[PDB]
Amino acid sequence: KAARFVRTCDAFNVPVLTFVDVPGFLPGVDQEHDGIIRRGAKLIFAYAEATVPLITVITRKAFGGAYNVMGSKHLGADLNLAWPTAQIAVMGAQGAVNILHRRTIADAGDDAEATRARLIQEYEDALLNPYTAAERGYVDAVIMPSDTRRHIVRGLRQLRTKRESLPPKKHGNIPL
Amino acid sequence: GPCAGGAVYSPAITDFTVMVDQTSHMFITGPDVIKTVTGEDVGFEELGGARTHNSTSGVAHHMAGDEKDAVEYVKQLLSYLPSNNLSEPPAFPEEADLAVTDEDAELDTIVPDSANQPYDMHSVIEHVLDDAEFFETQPLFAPNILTGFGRVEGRPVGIVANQPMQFAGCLDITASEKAARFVRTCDAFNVPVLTFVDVPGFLPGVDQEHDGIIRRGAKLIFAYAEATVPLITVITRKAFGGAYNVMGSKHLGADLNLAWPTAQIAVMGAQGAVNILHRRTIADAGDDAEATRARLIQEYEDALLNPYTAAERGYVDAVIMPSDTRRHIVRGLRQLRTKRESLPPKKHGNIPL
Amino acid sequence: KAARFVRTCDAFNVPVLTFVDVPGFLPGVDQEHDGIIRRGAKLIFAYAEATVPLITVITRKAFGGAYNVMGSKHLGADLNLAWPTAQIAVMGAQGAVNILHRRTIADAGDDAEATRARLIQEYEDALLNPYTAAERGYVDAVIMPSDTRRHIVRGLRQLRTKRESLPPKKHGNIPL
Amino acid sequence: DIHTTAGKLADLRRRIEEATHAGSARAVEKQHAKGKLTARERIDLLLDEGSFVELDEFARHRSTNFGLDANRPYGDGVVTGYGTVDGRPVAVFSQDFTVFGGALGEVYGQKIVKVMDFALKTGCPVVGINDSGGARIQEGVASLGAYGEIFRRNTHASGVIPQISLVV
C-alpha cells in the first residue's frame, strides 16, 4: 500500500511526510510463506529510491528493521525528528536482555523473575529513548511534539530546492 | 546460514538469491516470538529454510544441495550477466547451423493433437538454445511458468515460457511475479528475452481475485512494455484473451512475433465463446444443447482458433513451421542485436506493487 | 513558398494553422520536367519535421497526395478539423467511376451518360464528404464553420505545452 | 487432415505456395514479358542468398467496398522483410504489380510502415522497390492514410538510416 504511494508521490514531485510508531512486523508463518521478505522490501526501496523532500517524525516506537522501513536517515530522508517519547532501539526491552543477559535464567533460581524484570526497565531507563540515535545524529533533533508543524513547515521551506544524482539505469529491479 | 531480522531485506533487493537445503535460513520473525503472539509454532526449516523459500515464498531463486553446488550456481548466473548495465552480456561467439537439423525436425511433432494433451516446454526451449542447455531460475516456484538463461550463437538470452505440464500452463499471481521480475532483470542488464507461449488464460480462483491478480498479473504486462532489449516471442499453441497480450505480444512492443500452425489466437476458447455468441441459436430449435452447439464449436474452432486472423493484421510477423524456430530466433537476434529505443523522461515508472 | 514558411515557424516555436481547399496538383508536363516530385515533397517534409502545434482545418477539397501535403494528421498534425463542405477523397468524382466501373458504363452502355453521370453524383453524395475520413479518425472532428475560431482557441490553449523527440541526426536530408 | 498437428503443418505449406504466388501466372508472364522480374526475385537478387526473412507474408486486406472482399491475396501487393546485403543488415519492401496493379492498399502500407520502423529501430538501411500503378482507389481515404504514414516515416528517418528507392 505504502510502497506504491511513496513512488506515486516521488514520481510526481510530491513531498512525503512520514510519522512512525511501529513496534515491528506482524508475526506469522503466513506472513513469511507469502513472501514478507520480498514484499516488505518494497517500502525500503521506495524510500531509498525517492528524491523528493522526505521528513520523518518518530512519535513513539521504532524497533529493528521497521525503523529502517519508515523513512530513516539511512535510506536517505533529509530530516528526522524524534519526540521525547520515541523509543528507537534494535528491539524491545524484554527481547533485548532476554538474550543479552542470558546467564541469569536459572541463575538466582527463584529471584530470577525479579532479577530480569528490573533489567528490563534498567535498560529502557537508558535505551528506549531517541537519544542514542541522537548522539550519532541518526535523528537531526529531539523536539517537543508541539513543535512538529513548525518543524515540518520550516524544513519543507528549505527542502523545496533539493536535487541530486546517481548512476544511469533503464530502471530498477524492485522486488516484485 | 541464518539471515535474521531486518537483515533479510538486503538480499530481498538483490537480483538473485541462492541458498542450500538444510544449512541456511531467512526470516524477519523467529518462531518463538511467533508462538508468543499468534499461538503457532514451527521449526526454522519450515519457516524459512531453503526449500520453503524456493517453492512457497518466492523469495529465493535456487535451492542447491550443497555449498559447492551453490557456489557453482552463482558462477553460472554471473556467466549469463554483464559486469554492469553499460555492457552486453559476455558472448562466446559461435556460428549457427543455418540449415535444418534432425533436432529441429523433432519440433514438427512435439505438439499433441488433443488440446488437453500437454507437452514438455523444456524441450521446445532446449531445441532453441546452444547445446540444448537451459539454465533455469526458480524451477520450484510457480512451476507453471518457466524462466532462466541460455545462449544463442554464444550470446546470453533469457527465457519466459508457459509450461503446459504444470496446471495447464495457466498464468496465476505467483507466475506473474516470478516472470515479471525476471523480464525486468534481463532488461536492466541487456539480455534479450525469448517468450514461448502456450497459455489458456488465468487460473480461476476466488483466492486469486481476493488478492488482486488484477494488480499482480499487470506486473508482467508492464515489464514487457517497459522493456527495450530484443523481444522475440513464439506462440506454440494457445494464446487466449488477456493472456495473449500478457505473454510478450507485439502490442506490448515485441519486435518479432511468430506462430506455429498449431497456435490458437482468439479472444476466448471455443466453448465459452459460443455460449455467449449465437446463444439464441442454441436455446431455440433446442432439441438438446449439443446438436447445434457442437456443430457451432468447431465451425468456430476451424475458423478462428488458428494464428491466421492475427496474421492478416500483422499482430504476428509470420506463421512458421515449428522446425524453423531456432533458425528464426538466430536470424532475428542477429538483426535485433542493434535495437535502440526511447521514451519521455521519468524518475521512474509506477509499476503496480 | 509554404515549405520554408512552415520550417521558419517551426524553428522559432511559432504554431501553424493550416486551411485546406485543395483540388490537387497543377497539371502540366512542365511541372514534371521542373521537378514537382522533388519540390512539392518539401512541404511534406516541413510539416512532418515540425514540432510546433499544428491545427489544420479543411474547408472544402482535400484530394489525393494534396490531402497529405496539407498538414494532414498522417504527417503528425495534432488537430484536424473538417467543415461539412469538405471533400476528402483520393480523386474527384468523375475520375473515380471512370476507373471504378468501366464495365457498367460500357456494357448496356448504349446510353453512356445518365449512367456515368448517375454513377457520379452517387459517388459524390456517398464519398466526397469528410465523413469517411471522420470514421477512421483521420479527421478529429467535423465542425460547423462558425466554430472554427473557437476550436483553434481551445486547441492552442491545450497544445501550448506540447513536446516531442526523435532519434539524433546531425540534420535531416530534405529534397533540394 | 486438419484436426491433427500434421494437417496443420501441411495446411501452412499450401498457404506458403499461395502467398509465394499471389498474382496470376499470367500477370507473372506479362511482367517477365516487359523484361522485368517479380516482386520476389527483385528481392532474391538484392539480398544475400538465404538471408531474406519475410514479414507479414499472410497479411490480407479488410476493404469491403466494391468487390475486393472477393479477392484477398496473401501479402497485399507488397513483399517485405529483412535480410543482409554483403553481410550487412538491410530492410526491404518490394511492390507487386502482379496483384492489384500493385496499387497501394492500407495493409500494403502497414507492411511498409512495419519494415521502415524495423530498420529505424535496428539502424539499417531501407531499400524500397517501387513498382505500382498508384492508389488502390477502391479503399478510398485509407490509401491516402497509408501514404501519409510513410511520408512521415521517411522524414523522421531522413539522415538517420539510409533510404534507397529502386524504381522499376
SS (H, E, C) chain C: CHHHHHHHHHHCCCCEEEEEEECCCCCCHHHHHCCHHHHHHHHHHHHHHCCCCEEEEEEEEEEHHHHHHCCCHHHCCCEEEECCCCEEECCCHHHHHHHHCHHHHHCCCCCCCCCHHHHHHHHHHHHCCCHHHHHHCCCCEECCHHHHHHHHHHHHHHHCCCCCCCCCCCCCCCCC
The domains found in chain A, sorted by start residue, are 1-176 (3.90.226.10)
Chain C neighbors of D147, CB-CB under 8 A: 65, 68, 74
CA distances from A53 to A10, A67, A155, A165, B257 (A): 9, 19, 9, 14, 44
Grid coordinates representing C122? 452517387
Q: For B292, how many CA atoms within 13 A lie in the half-sphere containing its CB?
A: 14
The catalytic residue among B30, B58, B242, B272 is B242
Residue B233's nearest CA partner among B183, B179, B195 is: B195
Rg over alpha carbons for chain B, rounded to the nearest Å, is 22
Q: CA triplet C34, D148, C93: central angle to 5 degrees?
A: 75
Is A25 in contact with B26 (Cβ distance < 8 A)? no
CA distances from D59 to B234, B314, D112 (A): 18, 6, 12
Chain D neighbors of B340, CB-CB under 8 A: 121-123
Indicate the pairing of strand B145-152 with strand B135-137. Answer: antiparallel
- CB A70, CB A50: distance < 8 Å: no
Q: Looking at this protein, which amino acid is placed at residue B224?
A: Y
Does B243 qualify as catalytic in the annotation?
yes
Q: Nearest-CA residue of chain B relative to A51?
A: B347
- The separation between CA B333 and the C-alpha centre of its own chain, rounded to angstroms, equals 19
Strand partners, C61: C87
Length of chain D: 168
- Which of D149, D151, D159 is opposite residue C173, by nearest beta carbon? D159
Residue A2's nearest CA partner among A56, A38, A42, A30 is: A42
C-alpha to C-alpha distance for D30 and D36, rounded to whole angstroms = 9
C-alpha to C-alpha distance for B231 and B339, rounded to whole angstroms = 10
Instruction: Please provide residue A21's backbone torsions phi and psi, each rounded to the nearest 5 degrees.
Output: -130, 85
Helices (H), A36-143: 36-39, 41-49, 64-69, 93-100, 112-123, 131-135
Interhelix angle D141-157/C36-49, rounded to 10 degrees, is 80
First to last CA, chain A: 13
- Which of B113, B261, B331 is opposite residue D12, by nearest beta carbon? B261
Cα dihedral value B137, B139, B145, B146, nearest 10 = 50
C-alpha to C-alpha distance for B271 and B265, rounded to whole angstroms = 15
Q: What stretch of H or E contains C22?
A: strand C16-22
C168 touches chain B (CB under 8 A): no
Residue in the block written with cell 502540366: C28
Q: What stretch of H or E contains B126?
A: helix B121-126
CA distances from C56 to C1, C5, C146 (A): 18, 15, 15
Residue A148's nearest CA partner among C109, B292, B24, A140 is: A140
The catalytic residue among B6, B99, B285, B349 is B6
Strand partners, B148: B136, B159
C167 touches chain B (CB under 8 A): yes
Asked if chain C contacts chain D via 3 or more Cβ pairs within 8 Å, the reply is yes
Is B181 in contact with A170 (Cβ distance < 8 A)? no
The helix/strand/coil state of B129 is: coil
Of the CATH numbers 3.40.50.970, 1.10.3720.10, 3.90.226.10, 3.40.50.10190, which one belongs to the domain with range D1-168? 3.90.226.10
Q: Looking at this protein, which amino acid is placed at residue D78?
A: V
C-alpha to C-alpha distance for A158 and A148, rounded to whole angstroms = 15
To test the contact with chain D by mutation, choose from B198, B250, B317 the residue with the greatest count of D C-beta atoms within 10 A, namely B317
Grid coordinates representing B225? 512494455
Cβ within 8 Å of residue B337, ≥6 positions away: B155, B230, D122
Task: Please give the method by which this entry was determined.
Answer: X-ray
C-alpha to C-alpha distance for B139 and B161, rounded to whole angstroms = 12
Strand partners, B2: B25
- CB B192, CB B232: distance < 8 Å: yes
B39 touches chain A (CB under 8 A): no
The helix/strand/coil state of D47 is: coil
C-alpha to C-alpha distance for B170 and B142, rounded to whole angstroms = 10
Grid coordinates representing C88? 476528402
Grid coordinates representing A148? 512538529
- The separation between CA B32 and the C-alpha centre of its own chain, rounded to angstroms, equals 38
C105-123 in b/e burial notation, b at 16+ Cβ within 10 A? beeeeeeeeebbeebbeeb
C-alpha to C-alpha distance for B18 and B47, rounded to whole angstroms = 17
Does B242 qualify as catalytic in the annotation?
yes
Residue B320's nearest CA partner among B23, B148, B108, B143 is: B108
Grid coordinates representing A26? 506482524
Indicate the pairing of strand D53-54 with strand D78-85. Answer: antiparallel
- CB A33, CB B56: distance < 8 Å: yes
Q: What stretch of H or E contains D8?
A: helix D5-19
C-alpha to C-alpha distance for B130 and B119, rounded to whole angstroms = 21
Evaluated on CA atoms A42, A48, A51, A53, the torsion sign reads positive
- CB D150, CB D112: distance < 8 Å: yes
- Which of D144, D158, D160 is opposite residue C90, by nearest beta carbon? D144
Chains that touch A (3 or more CB pairs under 8 A): B
D96-113 in b/e burial notation, b at 16+ Cβ within 10 A? bbbbbebbbbbbbbbbbb
Residue A128's nearest CA partner among A170, A153, A99, A92 is: A92
C-alpha to C-alpha distance for B173 and B145, rounded to whole angstroms = 11
Q: How many Cβ atoms sit within 10 Å of the Cβ of residue B276?
A: 10
Resolution in units of Å = 2.4
- CB A104, CB A116: distance < 8 Å: yes
Grid coordinates representing C79? 488537430
Chain A neighbors of B15, CB-CB under 8 A: 173
Q: How many Cβ atoms sit within 10 Å of the Cβ of residue D138?
A: 21
The helix/strand/coil state of B280 is: helix
Residue in the block written with cell 506458403: D16
Q: Looking at this protein, which amino acid is placed at residue B139?
A: P
B257-275 in b/e burial notation, b at 16+ Cβ within 10 A? bbbbbbbbbbebbbeebbe
Chain B neighbors of A36, CB-CB under 8 A: 28
Cβ within 8 Å of residue B63, ≥6 positions away: B19, B20, B21, B50, B51, B54, B140
C-alpha to C-alpha distance for A2 and A30, rounded to whole angstroms = 20
C-alpha to C-alpha distance for B135 and B149, rounded to whole angstroms = 5
Interhelix angle C2-11/C36-49, rounded to 10 degrees, is 20
Grid coordinates representing B129? 538454445
CA distances from C111 to C98, C163, D131 (A): 15, 59, 37
